[PDB]
Amino acid sequence: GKGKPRGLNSARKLRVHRRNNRWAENNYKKRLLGTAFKSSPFGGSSHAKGIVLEKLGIESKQPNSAIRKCVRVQLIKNGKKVTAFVPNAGCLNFVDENDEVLLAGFGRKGKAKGDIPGVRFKVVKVSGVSLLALWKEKKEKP
Amino acid sequence: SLARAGKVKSQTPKVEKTEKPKKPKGRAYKRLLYTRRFVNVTLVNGKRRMNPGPS
Amino acid sequence: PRAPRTYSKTYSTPKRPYESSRLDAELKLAGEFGLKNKKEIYRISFQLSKIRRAARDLLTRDEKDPKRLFEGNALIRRLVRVGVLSEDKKKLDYVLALKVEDFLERRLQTQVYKLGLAASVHHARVLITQRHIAVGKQIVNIPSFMVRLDSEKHIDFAPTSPFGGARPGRVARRNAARK
RNA sequence: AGAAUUUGGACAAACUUGGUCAUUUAGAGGAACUAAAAGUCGUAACAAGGUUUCCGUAGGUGAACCUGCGGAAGGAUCAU
RNA sequence: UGACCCACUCGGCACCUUACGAGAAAUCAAAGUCUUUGGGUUCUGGGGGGAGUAUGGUCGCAAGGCUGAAACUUAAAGGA
RNA sequence: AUGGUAGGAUAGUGGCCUACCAUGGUUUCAACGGGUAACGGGGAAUAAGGGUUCGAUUCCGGAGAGGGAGCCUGAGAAACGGCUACCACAUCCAAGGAAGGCAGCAGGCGCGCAAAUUACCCAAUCCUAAUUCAGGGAGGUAGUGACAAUAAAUAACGAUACAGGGCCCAUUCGGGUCUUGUAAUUGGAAUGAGUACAAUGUAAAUACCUUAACGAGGAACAAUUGGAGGGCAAGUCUGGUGCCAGCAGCCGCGGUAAUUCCAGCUCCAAUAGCGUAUAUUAAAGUUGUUGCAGUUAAAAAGCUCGUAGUUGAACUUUGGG
Known about the structure:
The structure is cut from a larger assembly and holds chains A (142 residues), B (55 residues) and C (179 residues). Chain A has 1 helix and 5 strands, in the order H-E-E-E-E-E. Chain A has one helix at 12-19, and strands at residues 50-51, 70-71, 84-85, 100-103, 123-126. In chain A, the strands form 2 sheets. Chain A has a 3-stranded antiparallel beta sheet, with no helix packed on it. Chain A has a two-stranded antiparallel ribbon with strand order 2-3. The longest helix of chain B is centred in the middle third of the chain and has 4 residues, at 32-35. Chain B is elongated and about 55 Å long. The termini of chain B are far apart. The relative contact order of chain B is 0.08. At the B-C interface, loops of B face loops of C. It is classed as ribosome.
């Protein structure tokens, strides 16, 4: 006689005692307050527009040393101030201050990647022309 | 520091793509693959290293 | 607005992606049967996986119930017409013991090969894309066709075609216009 | 026919005032948090860690922490 | 009659022994009948911290409880 | 607020609004409230099944016309290329007074990561007339255009100077006769990318398709972008530097012979296209119904009662003809 009511008329007490439970399970937490719209940068999104400030330097977390390349942004929305991260080379160079940049996630949700600490985004485009190209030289910049 | 921005991909031996008798590109990448993966054997020392690094 | 026109993909990919398991049985397929891309091994795979349940579905009606027989005897005769399964096997039952590999022989791609009129499997194909082969007096330009058993004997070469008629064929309006 | 105007009405622009949600953001000052190459005073824990650790509570305590009650064993015993 | 012995049983409170099974293992008659995946239903968790704090809302006379963030930071923290 | 009864109201119905009346209607099967960086859907990405996100945007609805209101015409508007005001904008001025709404095409400004010519036509496509004939930045079509997508050139074939990888003989050369090949002499053939008569096309041209004339020898008519420890294809090559420059998505290199940095040669991968950052997907059986975990890894409530919720023993014509 495990812990649940079982007979026939035990609809009522079931549609409640899952709907309570669900709570805790983290996911169903995000989706009811859902956080996504109020908290976090993109709100209910995937991508966005921003414009750079400084070119900050963030060393490592440690089993590592690794002085990586990050940029503060200004979005073109809530305004948060965010940092974000660059790929490939130096990549830095090609992000010349107060330029237009196109930001996206980091495929991890929330969370925070690899050897970087409070950091949660990547730089996809600039000006809107790739980075991918303004490192495999299929275009160049204005 | 930002200095060392790029440092490596400066000092890269530039080096070139090399020209070729190109690779055929479709059906025909099947008749070509097939022949290698295993129809002449190919090699019989246990099994087949797909791409051996010169010993 | 208008009747929004209706369409299902045929493909159903795999559940695990990579495997030196199942992989090195596609490349044993392509290959042996012509084909091209993996977007064939997986078309079929779908359409067998399609039929397969309409059996499962039945079997679980009783036997004898109207629906079960009708489809079976309608289901079956759809596969007798395409050569797929024999005469002698059709109880129902049994269509289940049909692996990928039976269907492939009844693709025009290869039925040409067997009707040799083709050096290897290849010379079996350009031969279809190039308007060359023909069922009635009618061209077909697509490897995946599926041989309807009672045609088969009517498989050509057409009037149009260069290998049975209307003219020599381009490269010949050249060896006769430089001596 | 019937213009200006005009009675009272319903419509309700507007604006002033409060009064409030709801986002913002200032700020003498406090209180924490975390990141750092090697600054301090200690040695609490991991061995029976030299008083065996731990919980919940209550009061102490330059600081780690120490002491009462009752638990627990993750114990240093599954033993008359 | 009663204590007793034994035979049997139903209900306990445990224990030994196997492992056909399960498991990361240590071990487990249940942690078994689970990729051959489904008897009934209530709670909970989804990296480590920040922190069960700040906040609001509430129960208490108070100690305090129940509710319960985020920014920030981090490539491990952990189990056997 | 919810109904009754009657009237006004409308093109009508109805608390639409008012006379009087009754006290109802919604609510844990989530109402009312707060949020939405929400216009809805058709559908788009993803694609084994089940799924997760995005649909301001080529069609169907609705909503605005700088905010707000009110109404003149007409069947047909609460119209904004129609008017009154009001307010927030901002234009002319002889300062008396006038006049004004690109979120129609264009265009400039501002904003900002972020997106194009004040160009040519009613010839198609269709609509407006009183109407065959006007007119129609609706539409079309050029310009700019790497958003994507389709096709696919950038060199072929000789022969040679050797090297060969075979073979027929090797009593020792080595030739040889079927073959790829490093070549820094090679010579005949082949084309269009560009240029350009004509025809074409075009309302009118550009282009395309055609084609006379032209046009391929390497110093051209020259193909790039990203790596070459691992993940993960491929340099224990040379040069410089010495925990400093710098690289490195993560593990990590660098403190005097660096397979990582700067750079030379060399090779590897995509290739007219590569990278880079962001968001989303699969990967994710790390949100899970199909398919999770809860003895100690993060998790069984302190234990029991309970109104909802949810499940609920079996038995009511089978068999035979």
